[PDB]
């Protein structure tokens, strides 16, 4: 139930393919390459499915010298969702290294 199109509440879109080898591949909409990993054999006791992915914010058109990683879980059901916390790291000089990383969270629905 992870494969498909997911939306957060701020207009972002990601299209992911969940591989039988536990790979997560896809696109984060401009448009960037996404890549990560998920638990391909989760428990069936009500627990969600742990997963994570990364996007580096460079494509053919632009480059923000930064990258975001999302760490969370997939919860299936009537209203399937992916609940995440993220770290967004920017390339800084070592003087500014303490202020390099933002932390936040985001929920995705199949909306």
């Amino acid at each position: 139930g992870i494969t498909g199109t997911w939306y957060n509440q701020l207009g972002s879109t990601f299209i992911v393919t969940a591989g039988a080898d536990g790979a997560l591949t896809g696109t984060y909409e401009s448009r960037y390459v996404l890549t990560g990993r998920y638990d391909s054999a989760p428990a069936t006791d009500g627990s969600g499915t742990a997963l994570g992915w990364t996007v580096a914010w460079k494509n053919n058109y632009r480059n923000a010298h930064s990258a975001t990683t999302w760490s969370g879980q997939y919860v299936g059901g009537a209203e399937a969702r992916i609940n995440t916390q993220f770290l967004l790291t920017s390339g800084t000089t070592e003087a500014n290294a303490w202020k390099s990383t933002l932390v936040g969270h985001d929920t995705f629905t199949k909306v």
Copy 2:
């Protein structure tokens, strides 16, 4: 460069290949598949190179039902360093989700 064998303070071992257009692939070590991305065209001003990667903690011997993502930057220097912050998420029930995610930091060197 980024490509190489890296070690953290706790003795972990991280083997990466940095690809031509932003891919990170390799193994984390009990050896697990990692995947990520990096800024393939960083600043020329002394800024570091932003990157991130994910490991899902299942292999052909163990499954902890959890995933860790690392977000950081590569600093090229006399000692080349990769400085990160990580999020380790565990599959929980949604009543336990509040204690699902650990946060910490890690520094890798080629030594």
Copy 3:
């Protein structure tokens, strides 16, 4: 505006007073974790925030020791108050447990809490 009784989405209660010195004092009751009854909190807040529609930065700490139990840990919430039709305090938290050096790598939990004046 911050002074009042606040509840999170889990049923916990946050009774606080915002003083004029930027101080925050009060009591926290958690609905989850190793805890029971009330614990003391203290923190700080921006007593003169920007006029441009931004919110009010604040933070506080609870050490989870009271007369009923000791979880050997503390939590800090960091966030901002947003005054509006639906007044709300949005935070992120760090919960640190005392550990030995060996497991300090797993001493800290991070999550996010939203508080509202209506339960």
Copy 4:
């Protein structure tokens, strides 16, 4: 072992007093660089060699300056010769709703008696 003066490696200092029941009060630092702190610590920690859980907050406003922000530090004290306080922090800035997603920085810092 907590009461006193602590230093990080980026040229910052805090002076704390740890009161008998888990209170922490002090200053984070010239006058224009001085700010008030307050937090709590576990006043009856385990004797198993585990550290002492603590946390504190500084809002970045004093009599001269206002950064419209607050940092909370969450961590543990470890006694001994190299007495250390190991923390992770969260630094939140007041933003607009639109930019709340970029309001909070996360990082780590270590404090020593020397």
